[PDB]
Amino acid sequence: KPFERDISTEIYQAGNKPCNGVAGPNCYSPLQSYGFRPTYGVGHQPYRV
Amino acid sequence: STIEEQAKTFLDKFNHEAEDLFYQSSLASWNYNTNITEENVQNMNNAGDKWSAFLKEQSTLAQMYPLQEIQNLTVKLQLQALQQNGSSVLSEDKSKRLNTILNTMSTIYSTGKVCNPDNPQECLLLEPGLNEIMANSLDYNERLWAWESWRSEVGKQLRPLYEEYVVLKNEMARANHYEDYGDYWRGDYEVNGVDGYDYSRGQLIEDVEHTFEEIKPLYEHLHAYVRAKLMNAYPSYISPIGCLPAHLLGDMWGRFWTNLYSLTVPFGQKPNIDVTDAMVDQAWDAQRIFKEAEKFFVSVGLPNMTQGFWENSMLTDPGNVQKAVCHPTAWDLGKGDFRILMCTKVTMDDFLTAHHEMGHIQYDMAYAAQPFLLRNGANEGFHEAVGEIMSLSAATPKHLKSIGLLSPDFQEDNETEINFLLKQALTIVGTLPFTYMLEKWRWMVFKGEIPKDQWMKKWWEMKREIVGVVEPVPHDETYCDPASLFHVSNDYSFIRYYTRTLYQFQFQEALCQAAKHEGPLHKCDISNSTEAGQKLFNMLRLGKSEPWTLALENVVGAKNMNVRPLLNYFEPLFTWLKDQNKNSFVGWSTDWSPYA
Ligand SMILES: *[C@@H]1O[C@H](CO)[C@@H](O)[C@H](O)[C@H]1NC(C)=O
Ligand SMILES: *[C@@H]1O[C@H](CO)[C@@H](O)[C@H](O)[C@H]1NC(C)=O
Ligand SMILES: *[C@@H]1O[C@H](CO)[C@@H](O)[C@H](O)[C@H]1NC(C)=O
Ligand SMILES: *[C@@H]1O[C@H](CO)[C@@H](O)[C@H](O)[C@H]1NC(C)=O
Ligand SMILES: *[C@@H]1O[C@H](CO)[C@@H](O)[C@H](O)[C@H]1NC(C)=O
Ligand SMILES: [Zn+2]
């Protein structure tokens, strides 16, 4: 919903079986990392908004 | 939920991790190639091992989803690419010995040295000196010695190794779903699931055979002309009805006849078009060479180069202390980074090569939006085809005069067109029979039609029947003639060159119709036509998402490769060859051989 903050990392249960709080098959951590390097092209460079 | 959504989330995670890992590997490789040192080698090795391990892990993971439940026609292709089992299905000992055989073949090909006859002073490697001798030396005896010595040096050594290689790769293919390793190689051209645009793995065989059946008249007439010229150059060695001897073709394997332009020149008086002196007089450098190449793609409607590209790319040879490889390459490192590694000097060939590389980068930029697995050309041929169409258009006299390198005074006659068409003929038409023959031989060997005891007999018989080339010194089964070629030794597919050769001229015909050119196809420039640029960009943006059949339909209006554009391109030379071959026999007789 508009203007909402979520910070809790629960292992995504896309599969039909509970993840039990660990990573594995059909169990991925929701958070993913940008990697910023000077040689990256415009459009992948980090932008401050 | 459904496995389709599960597979979708898996693909998203894989894409976002693989982009970063591939960027690290590509940056390590670029650093190694630009600046060769032990630390750079260690970093590149680490990055490559990490990327290979990640690909193996993700390929093992992806096998959970059956492809039957996937019906998006994009997720299916990505999961198919991941499930191709890059993880070696073979046993541990089988994999270790296959790697050992590949390493041994590469080592023997790279370190194969030929020594002088009864002279231990020098033992020459293939690439540095022997290739130059074969290319430029006009000594029949020396060329025959070089060819025979290289054959005995490498083919005899690699024959048991090549037999073990074919056995192991056939076992790998049998372990996979593909019939044989030829089927594994042809699987790239396969299209499944899209009715009305589909392709079959065996359909490539029929298409290649039919295309060569159409090409054969032009090759026969060019063969007759080259036979007459080489008979004039070497009086006693060449027979009128017989096939050409192998060593006199121009290179070690007969792949390219470009070295024969001097011997078979149509008109000596007419000088070839070359802009080296003009560029020197106008004081150009590599940076503005690449800028002029960029202006062409800007004119056709495609985007222009990135500031990051200009900053990071090394287009000029550093020289002095710096050590680097000078093989031209266009790098799509990933995440918006594009670079050229080229030691570019002020020459016409370097200018055209710069055009070719920037064509590569425009393709890479176009398919950047698509997922990582699909971020490639639709088939192995389209990528160099897109390079080669730009290379061909750049060298046109109209483009040269528009740029201003060529003076307004000059006008092209019949002789200049004939000379240029015949040079490009020896470059392009000549390699098609060799590629056809090599792929047919290798496919038959993989399928098992050619027995081991008749490997080389069938090889040379098919070369005599198809390519019209006869072995100078007869060779028994101990020799392994194909093993000498680089692609055969290092296990590279070779039908890509045939497909590229057809595709580039189909693209050129389509884009010349788009540009509304009137006249012969050779004097066609697509510079200022924005219709042709958009028609190309339609395919360039797709990547592998759509089938290559649909991409080719989008560009040229046909779902299958056709040699009609190539024949239309070389029609003037075809007429000139009819005229010149009135007093020369057309066709070759198999019976004649230099021996007996
Ligand atoms: C790859 O090999 C595994 C066994 O290691 C098998 O389960 C899987 O189906 C194979 N994939 C294909 C498409 O050959
Ligand atoms: C080239 O790219 C720049 C942006 O990097 C753009 O402003 C410019 O219009 C493009 N074309 C020309 C002719 O410079
Ligand atoms: C190459 O890389 C090394 C670091 O490994 C660096 O010290 C050197 O300046 C670079 N350039 C050359 C020409 O060696
Ligand atoms: C393309 O357009 C430019 C515009 O200045 C012109 O100078 C050039 O001659 C044109 N090229 C061709 C081949 O028509
Ligand atoms: C082209 O060929 C015709 C027929 O021989 C000839 O009359 C004409 O002058 C030629 N043009 C040239 C010299 O390029
Ligand atoms: Zn290329």
- List, in order, residues 6 or more apart from B264 with CB less than 8 Å away: B225, B226, B229, B230, B422, B426
Q: How far apart are CA B274 and CA B277, in angstroms?
A: 8
- The closest ligand to the CA of B318 turns out to be 3
**Going by DSSP bridges, is the β-strand pair B329-334/B469-470 parallel, antiparallel, or unpaired?**
unpaired
Residues composing chain B: 596
**Which DSSP state fits B465?**
I
The CA–CA distances, whole Å, from A32 to B14, B20, B45, B367 equal 11, 11, 26, 24
Q: Read off φ and ψ for residue B453, nearest 5 degrees.
A: -70, -15
**Which residues share a beta bridge with B314?**
B341
The beta-strand segments (E) located in B200-285 are: 244-245
Specify the long-range contacts of residues A3-6, CB closer than 8 Å, at least 24 apart: none
What dihedral angle (degrees, nearest 10) is formed by the CA atoms of B24, B26, B28, B34? -150
- Selected for mutation to probe chain A from B13, B335, B339, B365 (highest A CB count within 10 Å) is B335
Residues in chain B within 8 Å Cβ distance of A41: 306, 308, 335-338
User: Per-residue DSSP letters for B77-113?
Assistant: HHHHHHTT--S--S-HHHHHHHHHHHHHHHHHHHH-E
B44 membership: H or E segment, kind and range: helix B38-62
Tokens of B225: 């002309």
Residues in a beta bridge with B119: B116
B266/B497 Cα distance (integer angstroms): 27
Method: cryo-EM
Residue that the structure tokens 């050129």 belong to: B508
Closest residue on chain B to A27 (Cα):
B10
Residues B81 and B297: their CA atoms lie apart, in Å, by 32
CA atoms of B87 and B168, how far apart (whole Å) = 16
Find tokens 């892990």 and name the residue: B57
Torsion from C-alpha of B184, B187, B189, B195, nearest 10 degrees? 160
The annotation places the binding site of B for Zn(2+) at: 356, 360, 384
Report the nearest atom of ligand 5 relative to the CA of B413.
14
Give dist(CA B190, CA B197) in Å, integer.
11
Q: Is A44 helix (H, G, I), strand (E, B) or coil?
A: coil
Say which amino acid occupies B579. Answer: D
**Cα angle vertex B564, ends B561, B570, to 5°?**
125
**Which of A28, A34, A37, A39 would best serve as a mutation to test chain B binding (most B beta carbons within 10 A)?**
A39
Contact across the interface for B16 and A26, Cβ inside 8 Å? no
Shortest CA gap A47–chain B (Å)? 15
- Which of B52, B242, B199, B160 minimizes the C-alpha distance to B550? B199
Neighbours of B453 (CB within 10 A): 8
Q: Which atom of ligand 1 is nearest to the CA of B177?
A: 14
Determine which residue's CA is closest to atom 7 belonging to ligand 2: B304
Q: Are B148 and B155 in contact (CB under 8 A)?
A: no
**CB-based burial of residue B186 (10 Å sphere; 0-12 exposed, 13-18 middle, 19+ buried)?**
buried
B37 touches ligand 3 (CB under 6 Å): yes
Pocket mutation for ligand 3, best pick of B35, B41, B323, B325 (most atoms within 8 Å of C-beta)? B35
The count of residues in chain A is 49
DSSP B273: P
Amino acid at site B395: A
What is the three-class DSSP state of B455? helix
Residues of B designated catalytic: 357, 487
Q: What whole-number distance in Å separates Cα of residue B546 and Cα of residue B208?
A: 23
Contact residues on chain A for B6, CB-CB shorter than 8 A: 14-15, 26
Q: Are the beta carbons of B432 and B212 closer than 8 angstroms?
A: yes
Spatial separation of the C-alpha atoms in residues B10 and A26, rounded to whole Å = 7
Task: Kindly give, in sequence order, each residue whose CB lies less than 8 Å from that of residue B120, ignoring residues fewer than 6 positions away.
Answer: none
- DSSP for B163-202, written as a single string: HHHHHHHHHHHHHSSSSSHHHHHHGGG-B-S-TTS-B-TT
Say how many CB pairs under 8 Å bridge A and B: 44
- Hunting for tokens 């004649």 — which residue is that? B592
Give the integer Cα–Cα distance in Å for B562 and B256. Answer: 22
> B415 alpha carbon to ligand 5 midpoint, in Å?
8
The closest alpha carbon to B343, from B360, B362, B323, belongs to: B323
Selection from B262, B264, B245 nearest residue B146 by Cα: B245
CA distances from A34 to A49, B20, B407 (A): 15, 9, 53
**Pair of tokens at residue B566:** 């190539």
Contacts of B92 (CB under 8 A, 6+ apart): none
Packing angle of the helix pair B3-34, B75-82 (nearest 10 deg): 60
What is the three-class DSSP state of A15? coil
